[PDB]
Design a binder for this molecule. Structure first.
Ligand SMILES: [Mg+2]
Ligand SMILES: [Zn+2]
Ligand SMILES: [Zn+2]
Ligand SMILES: [Zn+2]
Ligand SMILES: [Zn+2]
Lengths: 299, 299
């Protein structure tokens, strides 16, 4: 210890760098942490708090629930693509770790060729911008036209209630460097993006919410964005929606489709708000689903 | 491409540092990865390969199975203690990562006060020695007297079949610096070690296999060593044993007792061969058990 064996070295406390490497056929996937943030999931989920409390207890959890914010880097061998970008400073002092974690993972933001945005919530697009400038100076940003039409519209910002105006302001501030520079390239619905990566519409959580399907050599990873927020509730009961959903009915429907398809297909998913790295399989489990986190692997 | 187009970015491939920080009351726990190693679990498990193949498929796995090798650092404030040490180079080129991961975690070997060994298999004690020297030059090493007297006895080496002689050679070489320097301190069965950490006999896997029970401010973590090897088989069916067990009957009995106790108590377990970081809760699930990995947390 510091003093004989009577006093240990001080506790270091800090977490390991938030990146996780996973091969997927010929492709290299790097899950990137933006950090975590506590969520009042009792208030946010669209069911009685008592039910949320019972469900959290089953999983040895309590509200407020420390919730991951993840993004996913894909190096296809010919392109470097990033799926989502975290919050930068749009959502409190515990997020915005992605820039540091990308560097820790061995890449620089100049190397990113394209960025695919699941949806234009602040915890997905915030990381696009630092000091009025593009954080990724060479990237083309792609998102669904229905999200661009909704979140980048001054009319919508103007009629939004005061506590929602921030989400539009954040989207505009985040996507503007790219739009001005001719590096925002929308798509409409299901779209081939770069070989091995496709946009799959999963509209509901937002109007243009998009899933990204990544596949190489028979190995498939479906990046689901915000089709789930609270694993301890919404695997067992996928019908439970959340206040953050623009269209709760559509959001539930999309989640159920995605879970059913993953169960049937036996492929990996990655989800922005599953515990970091947020990657795993899904199996059916009666009326709900069971998440099977990916086995730890090292090259 | 256009003039001076750069080649596409090569894949980095290297994994993030294998450490995971977790607070346990006043104590800081650092799970340390020694790497992974593939195991032919279809052959090693004491049931027909078909049943193992079926179980693995259910969890989207297949043999050979990439198996984590974990150790656990605990900073109690008055002591820095390390539970197991990985393999160094005793079990191939994919292990022995503990030393680098300890450094990444913010500690040096010379800071470690005591080392508690669950059992003297190579993948638990190899990390004690480098260059015929103590890798941890201030530490007292502790293990069950029954394990010391089994593995560190020349008669048992010389009776062992050729393919098992390595385990005794490795144990002897790993412990020798400490034994020579008077820094190996055995215990016999259930023992208080330092405030907040106790040895709990869990004999079977080896003659002196020991569980370490860590507790602070009502928060308990039970470090189970090798009570489990193949989560995808042995949680659903704790009766299935493995060729690595010295006494398979006792091993199965100890595994069942520990799972039942953890389910009842609702406390955390950490296990050497559960996917890194190997920390979670256990709940009863019909005739077997379900592991609930800890939620990703960042200070
Ligand atoms: Mg289930
Ligand atoms: Zn969202
Ligand atoms: Zn989100
Ligand atoms: Zn063992
Ligand atoms: Zn072992």
């Amino acid at each position: 210890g510091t003093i004989g064996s009577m006093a240990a070295a001080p506790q270091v406390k800090t977490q390991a760098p938030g990146f996780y490497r996973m091969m997927l056929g010929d492709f290299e996937v790097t899950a990137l942490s933006d950090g975590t943030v506590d969520l009042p999931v009792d208030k946010l989920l669209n069911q009685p708090p008592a039910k949320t409390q019972s469900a959290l207890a089953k999983s040895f959890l309590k509200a407020p629930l420390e919730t991951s914010v993840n993004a996913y880097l894909v190096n296809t061998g010919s392109k470097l693509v990033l799926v989502d970008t975290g919050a930068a400073g749009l959502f409190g002092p515990t997020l915005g770790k992605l820039a540091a974690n990308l560097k820790a993972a061995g890449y620089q933001p100049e190397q990113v060729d394209e960025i695919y945005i699941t949806h234009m919530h602040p915890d997905h697009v915030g990381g696009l911008m630092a000091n009025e400038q593009a954080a990724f100076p060479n990237a083309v940003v792609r998102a669904d036209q229905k999200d661009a039409d909704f979140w980048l519209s001054q009319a919508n910002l103007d009629k939004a209630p005061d506590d929602e105006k921030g989400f539009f302001q954040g989207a505009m501030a985040s996507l503007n460097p790219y739009v001005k520079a001719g590096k925002f390239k929308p798509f409409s619905g299901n779209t081939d993006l770069v070989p091995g990566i496709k946009a799959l519409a999963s509209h509901g959580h937002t109007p243009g919410h998009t899933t990204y399907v990544v596949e190489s050599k028979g190995q498939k990873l479906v990046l689901l964005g915000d089709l789930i927020h609270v694993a301890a509730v919404q695997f067992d009961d996928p019908s439970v929606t959340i206040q953050f959903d623009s269209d709760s009915k559509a959001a539930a429907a999309e989640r159920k489709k995605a879970f059913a398809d993953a169960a049937k297909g036996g492929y990996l998913i990655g989800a922005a708000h599953l515990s970091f790295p947020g990657i795993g399989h899904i199996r059916a489990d009666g009326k709900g689903y069971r998440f099977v986190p990916v086995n730890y692997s090292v090259a």
